């Protein structure tokens with residue numbers, strides 16, 4: 164439906180120095196997920212792994228959680244809840260955990276939680292924060308987008324952002340960053356073209 168609210172998209176690094184990182188994968192036609200620093204935009208395939216890295220200068224307490232949420236980028240669509248198209252809503256798609264209409268899933272984590280906000284109508288997915296490996300600099304979450312940017316009845320060629328928030332056990336904001344996302348068939352190919360846009 165239509166949300167009444169619009170989520171905040173402002174970058175906020177906060178106490179813990181919270182930032183996002185991405186694999187630098189290139190644009191070889193074979194790559195399924197590649198990020199463009201120029202456009203601050205992730206190019207990913209339908210249902211393929213999209214790794215997103217959490218980087219903190221300071222370790223947040225335990226019980227901290229990581230939420231991901233999609234919104235439309237253009238002003239005239241902001242109040243519209245990003246949601247899978249009817250075809251992929253009805254698809255034999257289920258991973259056993261995720262609601263059939265959420266765009267964003269997390270793979271590899273039985274502690275995942277999915278939320279239909281009963282006041283705003285917004286979809287989000289939440290996982291526990293885990294500190295990096297001893298000897299790693301970052302935490303990695305594997306995200307899946309289950310509906311193409313092309314799908315009419317869904318996003319229908321309108322751009323989206325993903326909003327990653329850091330929250331504490333009670334849900335208070337600890338930090339926030341964001342990136343654009345396009346779910347296509349040719350991520351390597353469509354990034355180099357869009358990076359060719361710009362110049």
Ligand SMILES: [Zn+2]
Nearest residue numbers: 248251310314
């Ligand atoms: Zn779809």
